[PDB]
């Protein structure tokens, strides 16, 4: 993994040593090169993982997440250079430094082979994100959003640290391979119940579980565009990766403890879709859609079958790409009219046709349209839930109907109708924005062409 880790730590000095007008060019080009290099991790095995060294290893679950992280960095650079034109050179370099640090922490998080090093990195991702939000956000509420995000995550994750050190004392090791090979059943006792709670609650807060989700609209609405892109596409997936990894040691207690979380996930999936139906803000609509999809992923992990894990992996990758694209589209609209209200700017199809096409494609992927990987993951989760019980189909069908309703509602409201008459500053779409949307959407369809690359280790 060092062939990918070191070039990022070299992005840092290159960013600080490049000229004042070449920072964006250098950062974008070399981020793309590092993404290309990280594409080599997809050549996985059918039996075991890629054990690079004592510290880092890669799997069919880690590799797509690393590729998504490395691919997301240059897109964030493009959106950032859109909205950070008037900044000073030092502050531009500080923003790029925060993005690079976040990418480095995420890479080491997905490739860390110990639960304690994984904990350290997955908690280290909080600082750059908090700085980005509370420093380069636009509105007053960025401070409160940062407080909510930070304290929700830490309240979730501190009992996880206690549980991890306890498990290390009990079993002698926190290495994932050793805890997989030496796993023992978790007896039904109050102590085991609270160990299970510590671990799962950390990752449920990070996911987020319905009822532990308010920090998500607060932070995703109030963050800058790069912050929104990384919060939804990658940072939400630390919870899924952690829950998939740590449930090795939590059986058979997961069979009995998953009822409250499954009930919360299914009902809150319905509730957040219904909220999306009646949102006066576009960014909040996209955030609540993210909550619904992560609820589906939580259901998949909790029911915990080989078909549900594949659907969970596929849905995580697909949601990352789709939500990042939706945030970028909303941000272009905001940079036009300087407001997040959904009904302020209308007729954007007759003012900007190609952006209307991008909106159509992003909203067609947001709802599960076959054969997109969004649908593939959702359908695998639905099938596993059907095997779990036969009323999960009722809840899942209701969720799919509401998802289609609010996605097409967003499309029709923003793009169709008649343009607002007094908004006379809708300049033609930039090549940069068009290329950003294309770079979001083409990999999704190529992943549809080759779907075994994102179905996880259980494939």
């Amino acid at each position: 993994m060092l062939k990918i880790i070191i070039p990022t730590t070299m992005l840092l000095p290159m960013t600080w040593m490049s000229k004042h007008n070449m920072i964006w060019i250098n950062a974008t080009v070399h981020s793309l090169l590092i993404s290309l290099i990280s594409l080599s991790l997809l050549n996985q095995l059918g039996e075991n993982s890629l054990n690079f060294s004592l510290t880092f290893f890669s799997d069919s679950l880690s590799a797509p997440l690393l590729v998504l992280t490395t691919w997301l960095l240059p897109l964030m650079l493009m959106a950032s250079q859109s909205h950070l034109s008037k900044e000073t050179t030092t502050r531009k370099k500080l923003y790029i430094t925060m993005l690079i640090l976040l990418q480095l922490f995420l890479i080491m998080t997905f490739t860390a082979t110990e639960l304690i090093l994984f904990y350290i990195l997955f908690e280290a991702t909080l600082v750059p994100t908090l700085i980005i939000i509370t420093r380069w956000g636009n509105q007053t509420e960025r401070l409160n959003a940062g407080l909510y995000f930070l304290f929700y995550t830490l309240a979730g994750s501190l009992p996880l640290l206690v549980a991890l050190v306890y498990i290390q004392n009990t079993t002698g090791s926190l290495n994932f391979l050793i805890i997989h090979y030496w796993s023992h059943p978790l007896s039904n006792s109050w102590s085991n119940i609270f160990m299970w709670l510590a671990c799962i609650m950390a990752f449920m807060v990070k996911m987020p579980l319905y009822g532990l989700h308010l920090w998500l609209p607060k932070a995703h609405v109030e963050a800058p565009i790069a912050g929104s892109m990384v919060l939804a596409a990658v940072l939400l997936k630390l919870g899924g990766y952690g829950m998939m990894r740590i449930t090795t040691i939590l059986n058979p207690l997961t069979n009995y403890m998953a009822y409250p979380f499954l009930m919360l996930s299914m009902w809150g999936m319905i509730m957040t879709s219904s909220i999306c139906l009646r949102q006066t803000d576009l960014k909040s609509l996209i955030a609540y859609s993210s909550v619904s999809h992560m609820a589906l992923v939580i259901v998949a992990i909790m029911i915990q079958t080989p078909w549900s894990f594949m659907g969970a992996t596929a849905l995580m990758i697909a949601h990352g790409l789709t939500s990042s694209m939706l945030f970028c589209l909303a941000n272009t609209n905001y940079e036009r009219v300087h407001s997040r209200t959904m009904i302020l700017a209308r007729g954007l199809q007759t003012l900007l046709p190609l952006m209307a096409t991008w909106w159509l494609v992003a909203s067609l992927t947001n709802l599960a349209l076959p054969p997109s990987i969004n649908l593939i993951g959702e359908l695998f989760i639905i099938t596993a839930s059907f095997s779990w019980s036969n009323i999960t189909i009722i809840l899942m069908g209701m969720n799919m109907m509401i998802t289609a309703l609010y996605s097409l509602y967003m499309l029709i409201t923003t793009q169709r109708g008649k343009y607002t008459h007094h908004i006379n500053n809708i300049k033609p779409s930039f090549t940069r924005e068009n290329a950003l949307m294309a770079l979001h959407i083409l990999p999704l369809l190529l992943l549809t062409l080759n779907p075994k690359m994102i179905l996880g280790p259980l494939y």
Binding site: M17, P185, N251, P252, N255, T305, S387
Partner: protein, 121 residues
């Protein structure tokens, strides 16, 4: 205090004579490189606080920072390695001396061990 008061401990001795029988750290140790990195960061912060050009000014001062950090890190690594070797030595000796407390257990295969099966469905 676990190892404080261990027999034969000379007070106020950073590195005893018995530490000379251990392999000294390689000068290219990653921990030594990280100590040098800490020295370099201190030098840059010094330039920034004093409002000199961060990367250019005070090259002699930055060299002194890095050299001091590498020096102290080398000796610190030697002491750390010595203490860990001492801990392992004591633990092994105690296990050897207390066989009734650390007994060897007969190994049973998984064909003989019976484990409850918990289906996932």
């Amino acid at each position: 205090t676990m190892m404080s008061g261990r027999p034969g401990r000379v007070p106020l001795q950073f590195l005893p004579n018995e530490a000379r029988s251990l392999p000294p750290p390689k000068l290219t140790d990653p921990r030594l490189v990280y100590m040098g990195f800490l020295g370099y960061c201190s030098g840059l912060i010094d330039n920034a606080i004093r409002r000199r050009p961060v990367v250019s000014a005070g090259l002699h001062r930055q060299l002194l920072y890095v050299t001091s950090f590498v020096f102290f890190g080398y000796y610190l690594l030697k002491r750390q390695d010595y203490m860990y070797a001492l801990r392992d030595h004591d633990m092994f000796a105690y296990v050897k001396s207390h066989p009734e407390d650390f007994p060897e257990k007969d190994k049973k295969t998984y064909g003989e061990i019976l484990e409850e099966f918990h289906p996932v469905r």
